[PDB]
From a paper:
There is one hNaa60 molecule in the asymmetric unit in the hNaa60(1-242)/Ac-CoA structure. The C-terminal region extended from the GCN5-domain forms an amphipathic helix (α5) and interacts with a molecule in a neighbor asymmetric unit through hydrophobic interactions between α5-helix and a hydrophobic groove between the N-terminal β1 and β3 strands of the neighbor molecule. In hNaa60(1-242), the β7-β8 hairpin is located in close proximity to the α1-α2 loop, creating a more compact substrate binding site than that in hNaa50, where this region adopts a more flexible loop conformation (β6-β7 loop). In hNaa60(1-242), the β7-β8 hairpin covers the active site in a way similar to that observed in hNaa50, presumably leaving only one way for the substrate to access the active site, i.e. to enter from the opposite end into the same tunnel where Ac-CoA/CoA binds, which may accommodate access of a NAT substrate only. Indeed, superposition of hNaa60(1-242) structure on that of Hat1p, a typical KAT, in complex with a histone H4 peptide27 revealed obvious overlapping/clashing of the H4 peptide (a KAT substrate) with the β7-β8 hairpin of hNaa60(1-242). A solvent-derived malonate molecule is found beside Phe 34 and the ethanethioate moiety of Ac-CoA in the high-resolution hNaa60(1-242)/Ac-CoA structure. Superposition of this structure on that of hNaa50p/CoA/peptide shows that the malonate molecule overlaps well on the N-terminal methionine of the substrate peptide and residue Phe 34 in hNaa60 overlaps well on Phe 27 in hNaa50. However, in the hNaa60/Ac-CoA structure, a hydrophilic malonate molecule is found at the same location where the N-terminal methionine should bind as is indicated by the superposition, suggesting that Phe 34 may accommodate binding of hydrophilic substrate, too.
As the first N-terminal acetyltransferase discovered on an organelle, NatF, encoded by NAA60 and also named as Histone acetyltransferase type B protein 4 (HAT4), Naa60 or N-acetyltransferase 15 (NAT15), is the youngest member of the NAT family. As an N-terminal acetyltransferase, NatF can specifically catalyze acetylation of the N-terminal α-amine of most transmembrane proteins and has substrate preference towards proteins with Met-Lys-, Met-Val-, Met-Ala- and Met-Met-N-termini, thus partially overlapping substrate selectivity with NatC and NatE18. Another important feature of NatF is that this protein is anchored on the Golgi apparatus through its C-terminal membrane-integrating region and takes part in the maintaining of Golgi integrity.
Numbering used by the authors: 1 to 211
The structure:
C-alpha cells in the first residue's frame, strides 16, 4: 500500500443527502437490511421530499448506510405514540422520528451507525434546537442488535406495540424507543407529578427552604 494509497483512503468515506436517483439503490439495500417491506411510496418520499432528513454514508461513491428522519410538530405523532411528550409544551414543539437506520452488513461494527445517529443529532441542533424535544423510533421486539445499539446510546423503551409489523405476511411485535432532548419529558398529571416531586426535592436541606 503506497503513501499515495493511504492519502486517497482519507477521502473515500463521506456523507450526503439522498436524491431521487438513489431510489433503486436504496430499495436494494433496504431489502437486505430489514425483513419488513416498504411500499414504493416510501422510497419516493424519503428520496425526494425535503421535509425528510435523509442522510447517506458513502464509500467510494456507493451508499453503505443511511438514516432517514423527519422533524415535525408534536401533533403529527401517530396516535400509538401520542403520549411521548407532555401536551403543555408549546404548540410549536417538535419531535424527530427516525423512519430508518441501516448499514450494509459488511460494514457493521465500525461506527457507521453511530455516526449517522450523531449526524442526525447535529442536524437537529443546527436546524431545530429551539423546538425539538424528543427523538423516537420503532424496532422489532426480536431485534436485539438494534435494541442494544439504541439502549447503549441512552434511548429508553417506551411502548410495546403488538403486531406492529409484517414479515412476509406474518405479524410481529414492536417497541417504541425514545430519547428526550432539550428538556423534553413525558406527560404527567399534576397530581402524579406532585407525588413524584417529593423524591426530586428530597435532596434539599430543610434549612435551605423558607419556613
Ligand atoms: C428505525 C430503526 O431504527 S430500524 C433498526 C435499526 N436497523 C437495523 O436493525 C438494520 C440492521 N442492522 C444494522 O443496520 C446495524 O446493525 C445497525 C444500524 C443497528 C448498527 O450499525 P453499525 O454500523 O453496526 O453501528 P456501530 O458500528 O456504530 O455500533 C455497533 C456496535 O459496534 C461496536 N463498535 C462501534 N464502533 C466500533 C468500532 N469502531 N470498531 C469495532 N466495533 C465498534 C460497538 O460494540 C457497537 O455496539 P453496541 O451496539 O453494543 O453499542
Amino acid at each position: 500500500m503506497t503513501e499515495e494509497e493511504r492519502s486517497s483512503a482519507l477521502s473515500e468515506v463521506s456523507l450526503r443527502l439522498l436524491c431521487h436517483d438513489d431510489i433503486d439503490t436504496v430499495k436494494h439495500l433496504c431489502g437486505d437490511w430489514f425483513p419488513i417491506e416498504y411500499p414504493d411510496s416510501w422510497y419516493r418520499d424519503i428520496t425526494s421530499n425535503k421535509k425528510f432528513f435523509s442522510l447517506a454514508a458513502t464509500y467510494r461513491g456507493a451508499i453503505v448506510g443511511m438514516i432517514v428522519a423527519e422533524i415535525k410538530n408534536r401533533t403529527k405523532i401517530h396516535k400509538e405514540d401520542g403520549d411521548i411528550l407532555a401536551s403543555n409544551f408549546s404548540v410549536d414543539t417538535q419531535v424527530a422520528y427516525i423512519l430508518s437506520l441501516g448499514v450494509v452488513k459488511e460494514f457493521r461494527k465500525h461506527g457507521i451507525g453511530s455516526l449517522l445517529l450523531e449526524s442526525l443529532k447535529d442536524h437537529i441542533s443546527t436546524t431545530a434546537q429551539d423546538h425539538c424535544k424528543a427523538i423516537y423510533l420503532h424496532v422489532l421486539t426480536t431485534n436485539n442488535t438494534a435494541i442494544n445499539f439504541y439502549e447503549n446510546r441512552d434511548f429508553k423503551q417506551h411502548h410495546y406495540l403488538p403486531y406492529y409489523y409484517s414479515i412476509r405476511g406474518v405479524l410481529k411485535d414492536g417497541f417504541t424507543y425514545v430519547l428526550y432532548i432539550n428538556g423534553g419529558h413525558p406527560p404527567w398529571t399534576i397530581l402524579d407529578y406532585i407525588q413524584h416531586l417529593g423524591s426530586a426535592l428530597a435532596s434539599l436541606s430543610p434549612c435551605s427552604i423558607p419556613h
